[PDB]
Each structure stands twice: as structure tokens, then as C-alpha cells.
Amino acid sequence: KATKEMLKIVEPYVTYGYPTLSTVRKLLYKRGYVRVGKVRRYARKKIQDNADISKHLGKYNVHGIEDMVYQLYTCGPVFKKVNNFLWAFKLKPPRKGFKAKRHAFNEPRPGDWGNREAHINELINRMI
Amino acid sequence: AKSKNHTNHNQNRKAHKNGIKKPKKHKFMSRKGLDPNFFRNQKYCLKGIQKKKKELKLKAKQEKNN
Amino acid sequence: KSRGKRSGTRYKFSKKFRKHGECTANKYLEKLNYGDYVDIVCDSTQQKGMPFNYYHGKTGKIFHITKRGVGVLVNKRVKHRIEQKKVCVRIEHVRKSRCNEDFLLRKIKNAELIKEAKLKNEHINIKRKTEGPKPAAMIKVPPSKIITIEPLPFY
Amino acid sequence: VMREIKVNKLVLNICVGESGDRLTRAARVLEQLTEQKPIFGKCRKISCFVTVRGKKALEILEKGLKRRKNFSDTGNFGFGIGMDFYVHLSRSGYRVTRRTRRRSKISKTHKVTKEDAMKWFQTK
Amino acid sequence: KVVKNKAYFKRYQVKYRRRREGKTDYRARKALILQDKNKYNAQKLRFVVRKTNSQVICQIACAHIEGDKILAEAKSKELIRYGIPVGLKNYAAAYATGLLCARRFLKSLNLDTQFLGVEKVTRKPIKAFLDVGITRTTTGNRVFAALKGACDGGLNIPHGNNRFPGSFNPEQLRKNILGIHVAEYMKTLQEEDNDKYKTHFNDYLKNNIGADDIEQMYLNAHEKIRQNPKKLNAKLRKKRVKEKLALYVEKL
RNA sequence: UAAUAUGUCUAUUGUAGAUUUGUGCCCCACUUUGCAUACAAUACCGGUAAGCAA
RNA sequence: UAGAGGACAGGGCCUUGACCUAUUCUCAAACUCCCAAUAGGUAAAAAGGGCGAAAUAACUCAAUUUGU
RNA sequence: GCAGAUGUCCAAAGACAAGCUCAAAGAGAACAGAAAUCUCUUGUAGACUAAAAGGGGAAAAGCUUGUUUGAUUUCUAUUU
RNA sequence: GACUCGUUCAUACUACAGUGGCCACACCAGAUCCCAUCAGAACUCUGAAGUUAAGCACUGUAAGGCUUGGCUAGUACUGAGGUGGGAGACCGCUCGGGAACACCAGGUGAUGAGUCAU
């Protein structure tokens, strides 16, 4: 409720929706970057291994990109140490292009912003 | 010529430049003029413990130093 | 050109409908303690100890208590920072806060729940649930009970 | 069950509205009528009246026995001739409406209105 | 013109109950129940003296938000035990009730030994602070009797001597606390006439005592008390109003 | 006129607090010390009030 | 802006008004019975809280042992 | 910008307490009237509260009465 | 049964009929004083012969009225987006929030402790 309310105030400047398993796996594998550095000195680094994942989470037994996907899809007990550990994805512009960034995805006229629900997988894998 | 009489423009932006600071929240505040005849009694309370503690410590020091 | 003490308080300090008259009998019968959160609400029927222009409806800690007055610590925002201010008002203009009763029952809950949980050695969390997504459950909707509606045209 | 009309008060109306040299004579005739001292009207001094109770109430009533349209509706009657006349009566138990214990107000049917006033006037 | 119109009716107010039935004044009430806020739990236990049409009442009121609690209410009909069967509204009766509450609460505290009091008429005292009693007092009133009996038992109440015999008259104090101001009326009426004696001093002559015996019984009883203690519901209303309208269809 | 005050070469008192000591040479909790500093509390010095004043 | 009907005054059972009761048309930055949206404030536990003992005070309470 | 107001007034129009309830309307009453005075009924304030306006005020903050000088000295915590 | 200290500020109050004291109101009759009032009218006090007549305890009056529930109405209004419509005011659209003015019904609650009586 809290984050949905705080995101509704920013809805006209974003588009969001259901990620689904294949898309979360694609995002983590080919666009996943991780903060390996020390606290407040994070030094963004691509995953490329499981050593840093284990170093930050091995004592908390969620070591491995296997486990990170196993955990990000079904929001289990560790989302703090996954989302915050994961660097913000820097996506490419869409391959085929946006429809209208100025208008909502939900208006009858073509538009982009809003909740695409399950329709964001195509946009993500087009932007990836 | 006429001068800009007043405007609040840019003011809260200037405020948030360094942010809206907050009181430092000290644990103890002075009670210089706060309810006399009660904190005077508290002052009298403190000396009661102080005198016994001091005499006990001095006697222990003398008995241990011979 | 007019910045008096009561300027701009035509409706803020006006008495509500049916609420005219002095304060109730047992309004004088609240146990106020030091360091107590309290709301400061102006009562125009009582003129001495009237709260000042801006602090009506605010909330703050009690730092002073006198025979018929209360000193309240209220943070006020000016320009680029918030600073503490000590306002001394009479007790008819003071109403006990309803911020700490939200946790009074929680802290009584702790001493009865966490105690038994530890002594029996379970792990149970106590943080607020901030409930969002509803869980998954098996339901039974009746084929007779299910009814259909539809939209309407212009008229 | 003691429904009856009793006597509480009685006053006069000595109203002229002029300067001095006659308040003395007015108070003197009023004192000879009822032995007690009258008091004045407005003082913005233009009227006066006096009260007394006891058997003197019955005596002044007997003096004042001497139209059938303008009766009062609360047993508080008054008239005039020079002199005037005023008397305050009602049913008993009236004092709980004025006592420090339970200052209160009267109901309606227990008041005797003006029909009882006219009946009592013809009876007396 | 009508002042009882609906727009007027939609603006009325109400009074509050304790003054509305006349036990506290609601301004003196607030003044007595307010105490300094620096004194937390300062109960302000108020001594109350009141006069009925028949007896005298002395009570303790311990201030609470919900309401006050009396440890015990001093009664003037318990003086029948000590030696005052009738005459429970007298000056001596109020004095006896003051001594009653004082000494009985003193033995409740188990502090009679600590505060014996005084004999006849001339650590720290016991809690009491006076009530307004609504009424306007006068000199030599029986409100003094309870307070002075309580003082002679050991109690204390700050209270002005304006209403005191002499506006200082210890002779009138003696004449008061034993009630002999009825004895003076009795002697005067003896010399005046015997016509109203049957209707006035009936139970007194039934008891077969006198003016010099009023003081004796009162003093003996005061020493004794100093040393030892219908509805209709929704459907019913609907049925009845239907019956009423059906009846008035042809009634008048 | 002039800064604890001779009970003593222990050198005012608290809550935080850097460092040090150990017990379970490098992770942790308990005591051990309590820099600086902050918020206070106290005393004492000069002045002014108030009380007394040979 | 206008009414339904109706016990006070004026004129010739009649008339004219005034006035009255529940109703009618339209309005108020310096009018409110009611009253949003937005905006604003306080609270979200360890230098702390709960729970008992012991002490201390010249405070408070009738209390050298009620309370604070 | 708009409707205004201030450079005053008050030994009481300050303080306390008690008692009372006001404006108005209706019905009545020698002189006596639309009004001057008296009685009753209703009367949430439609009065009054020094002044401009806005708040507040009904065993009152209004009216009357009684007693008074707390409109006194000194110093704090503070709000606009 | 009653009252008491108090409470809750209208279930605790404004237009009509019905019940009333063994102990408790309240009415009583009076002024001699402590005494206080044009007036023993209030008040104080005196004692209890007559009284529930009153207020009121209560019941009830399709009354007032307390109030909420539904309906007004997703109407009015409004936060954010718009290279939306329109000559403008207005009017949609997407993400949200969301009133007020009439009617049917509930009846006029409850509080701890003590005394007297039974």
C-alpha cells in the first residue's frame, strides 16, 4: 500500500508492470549490475560471477544468481538485500520506439505512461 | 521608480538548498526559570546522595592507604 | 498593515455551533505529566493564557507545568529551518494528545506476547504488516448467487 | 392534594411623574394605608409603590373590594381609582421554582389561568 | 409573530446536570475541583456540609475524573445510638455529625491516639477543605457546627470567622453547639402562650425532657460519640398509533 | 573586592563519548578506564536585589 | 420575485392595508447549518520503555513515609 | 486594493463576591398617551459589554449592590 | 425502595394525559433570636399538624429534538498528465480523491462507593 501510493504520485513519469520470470532472468543475466564496493563506496560492477554475491549474502545463505532470481520473482524473506544490492538497470531506448511518452498507456489514443500490467515484458525485452 | 513590493519566489528553494534543519535534541535542558521551589528540592535531593557517597569513598581510601 | 495578536482569527478562534459556553467541568481533571505529547487547541471562551496566532491545532511536548498553566515545546518552521518554541498557555487551551495511545496498547501487547513467545522459544515478528497484496485462498462462489449487471446509455 | 389559592405578595401603583414637594405626601398617605415604606419608579423618579403582608393583606383586600373584561391570568390582579391596587396570588408549592435547591419552572395545567380568576372574582 | 419557530428551535442549548438538579454551583464546583497541576495526585479531598429539611449531612469527596468516592457519609440519624433520637437537624446535631465524621474517619486511620482533640468548649491535622454548599450563610449557622466538631475531634478547615458568634462570642458559641437557641424559644413561648405548644413541641414533650435536659442529652451523646462510635417498543408504538388514528377516524 | 578548601599530592557531579584492561594476535557481547566535546548539575568570585545587620 | 389562507388599524356585513403560519423566484470578497480535494502537524522504542526493591528531599499530601 | 479605526477614555468603565436577567413582542392597568410607569406570558441574547471591526460572554464577562486599590515592589521562562 | 458524593453534557433538554412514601426529596406555618431579607418574598432558624398540589422520579403524545443508516451521488467540486477538444468560458479523457441542501427508523442511556429501610 505504501509504495503503491508513493508511486501513484509519480505515475505520469514512469511505466511499470508485471516482470515475469523469463524477463527478470534476462534483466539479471544481461543487464544485471551489482554494488560490490563497500558501504557508500559501492562501485557498480557487472555480476560475471557469484563471488561478490556470496560475499555480500553468503552468510545470509542467498548466495548465487540462481538464488537471486529464485528470490526476486517470488518475493520471499530477503528483498532488502536483493533490490538494494542490485544496481539500477540502465536500459537502452526501445528497439521499435515509444508510442507517446506524453500520454497514458490507458487512454484510447496511443500513450505510454501508467501501469502496463503484463504488457511491460515486451517493452523490457525490446529495451534490453 | 517602483520597487518590487514583495515576493516569496525562490525562498523555499533557498531553504531546501541547505535543507530544513531541525533542533539538535539535547537530552538535558536548563530549567533556570522552570518551576522554582521544586527543582530547588531536587537540588537538595542530590546532595543527600552526594554526601554519603563522598564520605564512604573517603573512608575507604583512608582505610586502604593506612 | 495589520498584524495584531488575533489578526486573521475570525473563524479559527470562533466558537463552533452548539459549543458556546465555558469549558466542561472535568476538563480541569486531566493528569498532565512532564514530557507528555499534547495538542494545543485554542478556547476563545477563556481569554487568559490564550495560545498565540500560529500554534492552534499543533502538538508538542510538555516541558513546564504551573498551577494553572502549561509550557509546551512546539517546533515551528521559519525560513530555512525548524526551531523549538516554548509557548505558555492556560490548561483550558490544552488537550491531551492522541499520538501515544497508538503505542500504549502495543507496548502492553509486548509484555504479554513477546514474553510467552520467548519463554516457549518461538520466532515471531512484531513489525507492522503494511498489508499490500492480498494472499491466495480457495473460494466458493455460488452459481445461483452470481448475478450480472451492465452499463447504461444516455437519457 | 392541596389545590387552593393562597396569598404571597401585594403592591400598589402611585405614578404621577413630576418634580418634588409631593413625594413626601405620597409616601405619607401610602404609609398610612400600609405602614411600610414605598419605593420609586425609573431613575433615568416618576412613580412609586409599596408592599406589605400578613393580615394587612386581608385588610387592604377588604378595603379594595370597592368591569368584567380585563382580568389577569396568573392571580396577580391590579386596578386603580387617587390610588391603585395590586395583589399577587397563586397555588402553593411555588417556592421550589425559586429556592436555591432546585430553581425550576412551572407547568401549565397547574396554573389557574383566567377562567379561575373570573370564577374567584364573582365568588368574592 | 412566533418565537417558537423551527429556526429558533434548531439553535437551543442545555444546562449541565449537577447544577441542573442543584448540588454543586458549577462555578464554585470548578474552583474547588481545580488544584495546582504541579501537585499530581493531590486528591483535594473536600469536606462537605449540607442541610436537609430533616437532618444534617457531612461527607468527604475525593476528586476523580469519573466521580468522587465517600469513605463514609456522616449521619445524624446514628445519633439515636449516642443519645439524640429526634432533633437531628439542630446545631448540636450538626456538631455531633462533624465530630462523627472526624472521629470515625480518625479511627479508620487508626489515629485517635495521635489526635485526641479538645475537651468541652474553650503532629499535624487531618485532611479537609470546605465545600460551597450553594447557599449563602449567616452568622451562627449550623454549617459551623460540623466543622467545629471536626476540629474538636482533630480536623482542620481554613474558614473565616465572619459567620461566627460575634461579628468573637464564646458565650454564643456555647449557646450554639448545644442548640439552646431552641430552649430560648421554648422559654419565650412558655410565657407567651400554650396554644401553639401542642403543634410545635409535640415529640419533645412526648420524650418528656426540658431546656436544661436538651443540653444534657446533647453533651452526653457528643461525649459518647467522641469516645466510641411503562416502557413501549417500536412495534408497540406503531400498533398503538394505528389504533389511535383508527379510533379518531370516528371519535370526534 | 577577587574564584571548591584543608577535610587530601583522591585535582566538583552526571548522560553520551575517543582510547586502554581483561573474560568468553585477528569478528562479536560483558565488565575497566572516561580524552576532547556536547548537553546539563553543582559549588565559588565581582556586581545588583531580598533577609539580617554592631 | 410572489403567493395559499387567516384574530389589529382605516373607510363604506363589505373594502383597504398592516401583520401572521407552513410555501415560491433569484443572490453575498468583507453570510454561514454543512463542508471537500490539495496543503499542514505530531507519533512511529535502547542516552529509551516496562516492571519491583532500596535509598534522598527543605517539594506535595493529614503523612520522616501518601505521592512526585 | 476595498469597508473602516488609533495617537483617546475610565477611582471606575480597575479587583473580588453576591443577587438578578437582558432586547423585543403580546395581553392587560386612576390620571397616563405610539411611546413615560406597573403586572403577567414568551423570550439562546435578537440587549448590554467606552470606542472601529471581528471574536467571547446568561446563579455572566451584562444590570444592581457591598467591600476594596493587584492600575503595588523585584526577578525569571518566554509569544507576537 | 430511597437517597448521597460525583459523573457522563441532551437517551442528561422544549409543546399534552397518568402514578407519589415506613425510613429520603420536595410542599409545611411562623418570625423570638445567631440572625439575614420593602416583604421570614428568597435565606437562616424553629418544630412537624395538613400535601404530592407542584417541580420532578418515571410512563406514554405517529410532537420538538439527540442523532446516525440508506438515498442525494460517484452528482457538485478537486490533486497530477495532456503538442486533449474548443474563437473563449467551459468540456472530456488517464492515474486518484470525493461533498452539501429533503425523507424512514431507535428510544430518550449509563457511572463507582456509603447509609437508612425491607
Tab-separated table of N, CA, C and O (backbone and C1' of nucleotides) in Angstrom, chain F residues 6-35:
chain	number	residue	atom	x	y	z
F	6	U	P	37.989	24.451	55.056
F	6	U	O5'	38.580	23.064	55.566
F	6	U	C5'	39.831	23.015	56.241
F	6	U	C4'	40.603	21.763	55.911
F	6	U	C3'	41.862	21.553	56.747
F	6	U	O3'	42.092	20.155	56.907
F	6	U	C1'	42.459	21.724	54.478
F	7	G	P	42.000	19.483	58.362
F	7	G	O5'	40.834	18.409	58.215
F	7	G	C5'	39.492	18.743	58.549
F	7	G	C4'	38.508	18.175	57.556
F	7	G	C3'	38.530	16.654	57.408
F	7	G	O3'	37.207	16.183	57.153
F	7	G	C1'	38.997	17.660	55.323
F	8	U	O5'	44.475	13.772	53.666
F	8	U	C5'	45.307	13.085	52.737
F	8	U	C4'	45.429	13.829	51.429
F	8	U	C3'	45.992	15.246	51.528
F	8	U	O3'	46.778	15.532	50.372
F	8	U	C1'	43.824	15.321	50.588
F	9	C	P	48.076	16.470	50.501
F	9	C	O5'	49.092	15.894	49.420
F	9	C	C5'	49.673	14.602	49.561
F	9	C	C4'	49.800	13.932	48.218
F	9	C	C3'	51.196	13.954	47.608
F	9	C	O3'	51.373	12.803	46.784
F	9	C	C1'	49.714	15.216	46.250
F	10	U	O5'	43.317	11.027	41.739
F	10	U	C5'	42.519	12.131	42.137
F	10	U	C4'	41.570	11.757	43.249
F	10	U	C3'	40.955	12.922	44.013
F	10	U	O3'	39.811	13.453	43.363
F	10	U	C1'	41.819	11.343	45.547
F	11	A	P	39.198	14.880	43.785
F	11	A	O5'	40.330	15.926	43.389
F	11	A	C5'	40.059	17.319	43.383
F	11	A	C4'	40.857	18.026	42.317
F	11	A	C3'	40.634	17.544	40.892
F	11	A	O3'	39.500	18.150	40.297
F	11	A	C1'	42.961	17.761	41.326
F	12	U	P	38.377	17.262	39.569
F	12	U	O5'	37.010	17.817	40.168
F	12	U	C5'	36.860	18.004	41.567
F	12	U	C4'	35.411	17.975	41.982
F	12	U	C3'	34.501	17.069	41.171
F	12	U	O3'	34.596	15.709	41.555
F	12	U	C1'	33.452	19.164	41.506
F	13	U	P	34.232	14.546	40.508
F	13	U	O5'	32.646	14.619	40.386
F	13	U	C5'	31.814	14.348	41.504
F	13	U	C4'	30.363	14.303	41.103
F	13	U	C3'	30.057	13.493	39.856
F	13	U	O3'	29.960	12.107	40.129
F	13	U	C1'	28.951	15.584	39.739
F	14	G	P	29.958	11.041	38.930
F	14	G	O5'	28.419	10.909	38.550
F	14	G	C5'	28.026	10.523	37.245
F	14	G	C4'	26.737	11.190	36.840
F	14	G	C3'	26.290	10.934	35.411
F	14	G	O3'	25.587	9.712	35.295
F	14	G	C1'	26.096	13.245	35.927
F	15	U	P	26.253	8.454	34.558
F	15	U	O5'	25.403	8.322	33.221
F	15	U	C5'	24.082	8.836	33.145
F	15	U	C4'	23.777	9.321	31.753
F	15	U	C3'	24.676	8.758	30.669
F	15	U	O3'	24.252	7.476	30.245
F	15	U	C1'	24.458	11.104	30.395
F	16	A	P	25.277	6.489	29.509
F	16	A	O5'	25.173	6.922	27.983
F	16	A	C5'	26.301	6.835	27.132
F	16	A	C4'	26.272	7.897	26.066
F	16	A	C3'	27.543	8.031	25.249
F	16	A	O3'	27.633	7.061	24.221
F	16	A	C1'	26.840	10.170	25.950
F	17	G	P	28.631	5.812	24.373
F	17	G	O5'	29.981	6.329	23.712
F	17	G	C5'	29.946	7.156	22.561
F	17	G	C4'	30.947	8.277	22.653
F	17	G	C3'	32.369	7.877	22.999
F	17	G	O3'	33.079	7.351	21.894
F	17	G	C1'	31.745	9.748	24.292
F	18	A	P	33.629	5.843	21.934
F	18	A	O5'	35.069	5.951	21.268
F	18	A	C5'	35.281	6.770	20.129
F	18	A	C4'	36.647	7.404	20.161
F	18	A	C3'	37.775	6.500	20.625
F	18	A	O3'	38.247	5.611	19.628
F	18	A	C1'	37.905	8.529	21.792
F	19	U	P	38.278	4.032	19.928
F	19	U	O5'	39.520	3.852	20.907
F	19	U	C5'	40.818	4.252	20.501
F	19	U	C4'	41.709	4.566	21.677
F	19	U	C3'	42.081	3.407	22.581
F	19	U	O3'	43.081	2.568	22.034
F	19	U	C1'	41.491	5.268	23.901
F	20	U	P	42.915	0.973	22.114
F	20	U	O5'	43.304	0.625	23.618
F	20	U	C5'	44.564	1.011	24.143
F	20	U	C4'	44.619	0.851	25.641
F	20	U	C3'	44.243	-0.518	26.180
F	20	U	O3'	45.290	-1.465	26.081
F	20	U	C1'	43.137	1.140	27.434
F	21	U	P	44.946	-3.027	25.932
F	21	U	O5'	44.316	-3.422	27.341
F	21	U	C5'	45.087	-3.340	28.530
F	21	U	C4'	44.330	-3.875	29.718
F	21	U	C3'	43.720	-5.254	29.545
F	21	U	O3'	44.664	-6.286	29.755
F	21	U	C1'	42.138	-3.795	30.535
F	22	G	P	44.850	-7.446	28.663
F	22	G	O5'	44.632	-8.783	29.497
F	22	G	C5'	43.564	-9.662	29.187
F	22	G	C4'	42.518	-9.669	30.273
F	22	G	C3'	41.326	-10.578	30.025
F	22	G	O3'	41.593	-11.924	30.369
F	22	G	C1'	40.561	-8.452	30.708
F	23	U	P	41.613	-13.057	29.233
F	23	U	O5'	40.279	-13.880	29.502
F	23	U	C5'	39.858	-14.166	30.827
F	23	U	C4'	38.356	-14.161	30.933
F	23	U	C3'	37.618	-14.875	29.814
F	23	U	O3'	37.566	-16.278	30.002
F	23	U	C1'	36.623	-12.765	30.194
F	24	G	P	38.032	-17.270	28.828
F	24	G	O5'	36.795	-18.257	28.653
F	24	G	C5'	36.163	-18.416	27.392
F	24	G	C4'	34.819	-17.734	27.359
F	24	G	C3'	34.112	-17.733	26.011
F	24	G	O3'	33.408	-18.935	25.753
F	24	G	C1'	34.117	-15.546	26.879
F	25	C	O5'	49.004	-10.927	20.701
F	25	C	C5'	49.346	-10.011	19.666
F	25	C	C4'	48.371	-10.073	18.514
F	25	C	C3'	46.913	-9.789	18.872
F	25	C	O3'	46.280	-9.122	17.781
F	25	C	C1'	47.087	-11.950	17.939
F	26	C	P	45.000	-8.185	18.036
F	26	C	O5'	43.926	-8.699	16.976
F	26	C	C5'	43.778	-8.051	15.721
F	26	C	C4'	43.030	-8.903	14.725
F	26	C	C3'	41.640	-9.367	15.129
F	26	C	O3'	40.660	-8.360	14.942
F	26	C	C1'	42.844	-11.154	14.119
F	27	C	P	39.380	-8.266	15.910
F	27	C	O5'	38.216	-8.982	15.090
F	27	C	C5'	37.638	-8.359	13.952
F	27	C	C4'	36.214	-8.809	13.737
F	27	C	C3'	35.251	-8.534	14.882
F	27	C	O3'	34.745	-7.210	14.859
F	27	C	C1'	34.996	-10.772	14.150
F	28	C	P	34.160	-6.532	16.193
F	28	C	O5'	32.666	-7.078	16.289
F	28	C	C5'	31.843	-6.754	17.402
F	28	C	C4'	30.934	-7.898	17.774
F	28	C	C3'	30.767	-8.145	19.269
F	28	C	O3'	29.816	-7.301	19.913
F	28	C	C1'	31.321	-10.178	18.211
F	29	A	P	28.362	-6.991	19.288
F	29	A	O5'	27.366	-7.216	20.512
F	29	A	C5'	27.535	-6.521	21.740
F	29	A	C4'	27.370	-7.442	22.924
F	29	A	C3'	27.867	-6.897	24.257
F	29	A	O3'	26.887	-6.107	24.908
F	29	A	C1'	28.743	-9.070	23.913
F	30	C	P	27.232	-5.314	26.263
F	30	C	O5'	27.101	-6.415	27.407
F	30	C	C5'	27.102	-6.039	28.776
F	30	C	C4'	27.994	-6.932	29.602
F	30	C	C3'	29.072	-6.225	30.406
F	30	C	O3'	28.582	-5.685	31.619
F	30	C	C1'	30.005	-8.094	29.296
F	31	U	P	28.171	-4.135	31.706
F	31	U	O5'	28.695	-3.683	33.140
F	31	U	C5'	30.005	-3.162	33.306
F	31	U	C4'	30.967	-4.219	33.787
F	31	U	C3'	32.366	-3.729	34.127
F	31	U	O3'	32.456	-3.170	35.425
F	31	U	C1'	32.528	-5.622	32.738
F	32	U	P	33.559	-2.047	35.745
F	32	U	O5'	34.913	-2.663	35.176
F	32	U	C5'	36.102	-2.656	35.951
F	32	U	C4'	37.196	-1.888	35.258
F	32	U	C3'	36.905	-0.420	35.001
F	32	U	O3'	37.158	0.395	36.131
F	32	U	C1'	37.760	-1.414	33.033
F	33	U	P	36.440	1.823	36.269
F	33	U	O5'	37.343	2.794	35.387
F	33	U	C5'	38.721	2.970	35.679
F	33	U	C4'	39.488	3.436	34.467
F	33	U	C3'	39.040	4.755	33.862
F	33	U	O3'	39.568	5.878	34.544
F	33	U	C1'	39.311	3.150	32.148
F	34	G	P	38.587	7.027	35.086
F	34	G	O5'	38.041	7.722	33.760
F	34	G	C5'	38.943	8.179	32.759
F	34	G	C4'	38.224	8.697	31.537
F	34	G	C3'	37.269	9.868	31.775
F	34	G	O3'	37.315	10.738	30.648
F	34	G	C1'	36.099	8.093	30.770
F	35	C	P	37.312	12.331	30.846
F	35	C	O5'	38.682	12.790	30.177
F	35	C	C5'	39.499	11.843	29.506
F	35	C	C4'	40.353	12.482	28.441
F	35	C	C3'	39.830	13.784	27.854
F	35	C	O3'	40.160	14.915	28.642
F	35	C	C1'	40.447	12.328	26.102
